[PDB]
UniProtKB/Swiss-Prot annotation:
The modification N6-succinyllysine is found at K67, K242, K243, K301, K356, K499, K525, K584. The keyword Phosphoprotein applies. Belongs to the heat shock protein 70 family. Keywords: Acetylation, ATP-binding, Cell inner membrane, Cell membrane, Chaperone, Cytoplasm, DNA replication, Membrane, Nucleotide-binding, Phosphoprotein, Stress response. One of its GO terms (biological process) is stress response to copper ion. The gene is dnaK. This is Chaperone protein DnaK.
Length: 600
């Protein structure tokens, strides 16, 4: 299992290297890869940086920000706004889904988002060397089943089985190590990403027995930070250039795009230094030749352009508390996600509000992928839960007198499940039993798979039929099989624990179905002998004592005749012959008319 972080703007993939988190890097040498897919006009399907690097050249067939659309329907508040702003041809699907039209062909966005996952899968495979067939994947907290399944569908289309699908706040909490080692923590997750903002206030409780990861309150914004802020700076840089160099840029789409990317980088520096220089060679050209742009910007000029939108990240931070009914002191940890959370101004303004400095002790364009890795790796490794009734192949049971499998857990029942049956000793003055744990579907125990065996010794000198030996089969929720046997007279228990990976594999399971379905006639022909052998054993044993109870009440001829037939039954019961046993039981029973009158 690999940990994929599927973002809005940017994608990152990770694994657990033993116990240690490892964050991987693409063939181009990038870690956090852009979640951009572009169908080049002459047919090439590009992903990532080579999808951004041509994005000006073929925008109508450039797909970005698909997490907004992934599993929403044509009439929705996001899709209706996306259709108003997004350059690529969004359409209504034939089911009313929000779909894309590219180069004239209609496609379902799990198919599109798969090209991120196929690149991430390749990126992961390229480090490991072995083919990967499994994933864990991220989502926001406020996504419904259709949006959660759409991401799992995107996984399946990539040949990645989605072995869990986890939330971005859970991933954030896991990433900074909040799996264990407190009784309770109340966390604030501040996600100020590439092109979205989320606040999720979440509770991690261990006091219900080391299990709850719950979302208490979430809020967020659609067009926050960034676009209305960087626009104050873009416009200053335009008006400074218009002033200094006597030419406009709002007319130039390329200069706007380059000014956007350049100034957005500069803004991120100026919250971490006093100054940086907005240098742009060959920005625009006119009758006086080219214009080279070099504008000096400071935090001080910046701070006086940008009085607004960080506060718009402290405003929903109020509702997320007001709806929950908690105070800033009740929160243990304020934890950061998203690449804008390297800008001092948000780190400062979050600290100022919460009072305790936010944690960024794991890199916040990777952490949310480490949150996938730490679940995917050692955890979903193995571990956890759910409930009962039916599914879910082969039967589990034990060997009983006859050499027959007696079934405790039936074929096609789910986990966890607890069932039991009461057994006994087979001989008089028998002080112990073997418990042989069978997996299979055949009658004859020697034809089923021996999972294990154990003993229960120390049964008191009782007569047979009487010692109440309970055998209990318990299958836990990790699939681990626990078999327990107990004497109810003394209370002396013995156990065995058998792994979910013990016993028969898929092909052995298929054989067993073919084996048990084909040999049904042969197995019944045995089961119908086991029944007769056991009836004969009861009669042989009881009629021996019905003589010993009778004594001098029983005449010599009867004693002579009955004891003769008792011997012969004890010979026939060393045969595999049913008919001889049924006959010798009759040859015996016929002569026990007077014996039964005495035993009566």
């Amino acid at each position: 299992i690999i940990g994929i972080d599927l973002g809005t703007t940017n994608s990152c993939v990770a694994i657990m290297d033993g116990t240690t988190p490892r964050v991987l890097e693409n063939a181009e040498g990038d870690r956090t890869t852009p979640s951009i897919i572009a169908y080049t006009q002459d047919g090439e399907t590009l992903v990532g940086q080579p999808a951004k690097r041509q994005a000006v050249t073929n925008p109508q067939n450039t797909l970005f920000a698909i997490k907004r659309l992934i599993g929403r329907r044509f009439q929705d508040e996001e899709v209706q706004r996306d259709v108003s702003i997004m350059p690529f041809k969004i359409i209504a699907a034939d089911n009313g889904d929000a779909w894309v039209e590219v180069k004239g062909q209609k496609m379902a966005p799990p198919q599109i988002s798969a090209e991120v996952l196929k690149k991430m899968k390749k990126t992961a495979e390229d480090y490991l060397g072995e083919p990967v067939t499994e994933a864990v994947i991220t989502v926001p907290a406020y996504f419904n089943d259709a949006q959660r399944q759409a991401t799992k569908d995107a996984g399946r289309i990539a040949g990645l089985e989605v072995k869990r699908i986890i939330n971005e706040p859970t991933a954030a909490a896991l990433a900074y190590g909040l799996d264990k080692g407190t009784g309770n923590r109340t966390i604030a997750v501040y996600d100020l990403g590439g092109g979205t903002f989320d606040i999720s206030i979440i509770e991690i409780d261990e006091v219900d027995g080391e299990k709850t990861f719950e979302v208490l309150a979430t809020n967020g914004d659609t067009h926050l930070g960034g676009e209305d802020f960087d626009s104050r700076l873009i416009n200053y840089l335009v008006e400074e250039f218009k002033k200094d160099q006597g030419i406009d840029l709002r007319n130039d789409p390329l200069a706007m795009q380059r000014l956007k990317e350049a100034a957005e980088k500069a803004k991120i520096e100026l919250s971490s230094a006093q100054q940086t220089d907005v240098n742009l060679p060959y920005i625009t050209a006119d009758a006086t030749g080219p214009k080279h742009m070099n504008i000096k910007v400071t935090r001080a000029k910046l701070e006086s352009l940008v009085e607004d939108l960080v506060n718009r990240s402290i405003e929903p931070l109020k509702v997320a508390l007001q709806d929950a009914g908690l105070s800033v002191s009740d929160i243990d940890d304020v934890i950061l996600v998203g690449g804008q959370t390297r800008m001092p101004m948000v780190q400062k303004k979050v600290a100022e509000f919460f009072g305790k400095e936010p944690r960024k002790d794991v890199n916040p364009d990777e952490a949310v992928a480490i949150g996938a890795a730490v679940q995917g790796g050692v955890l979903t490794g193995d571990v956890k839960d759910v409930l009962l009734l039916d599914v879910t192949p082969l039967s589990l049971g034990i060997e009983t007198m006859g050499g027959v499998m007696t079934t405790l857990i039936a074929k096609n029942t789910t986990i966890p499940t607890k069932h039991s049956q009461v057994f006994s000793t087979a001989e008089d003055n028998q002080s112990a039993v073997t418990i042989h744990v069978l997996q299979g579907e055949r009658k004859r125990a020697a034809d089923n798979k021996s999972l294990g065996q154990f003993n229960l010794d120390g049964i008191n000198p009782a007569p047979r039929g009487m010692p109440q030996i309970e055998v209990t089969f318990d299958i836990d929720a990790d699939g681990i099989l626990h078999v327990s046997a107990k004497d109810k007279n003394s209370g002396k228990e013995q156990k065995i624990t058998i792994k979910a990976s013990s016993g028969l594999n898929e092909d052995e399971i298929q054989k067993m179905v073919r084996d048990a379905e084909a040999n049904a006639e042969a197995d019944r022909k045995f089961d119908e002998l086991v029944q007769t052998r056991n009836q004969g054993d009861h009669l042989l044993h009881s009629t021996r004592k019905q003589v010993e109870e009778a004594g001098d009440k029983l005449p010599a001829d009867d004693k002579t005749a009955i004891e003769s037939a008792l011997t012969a039954l004890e010979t026939a019961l060393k045969g595999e012959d049913k008919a001889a046993i049924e006959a010798k039981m009759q040859e015996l029973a016929q002569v026990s008319q007077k014996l039964m009158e005495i035993a009566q």
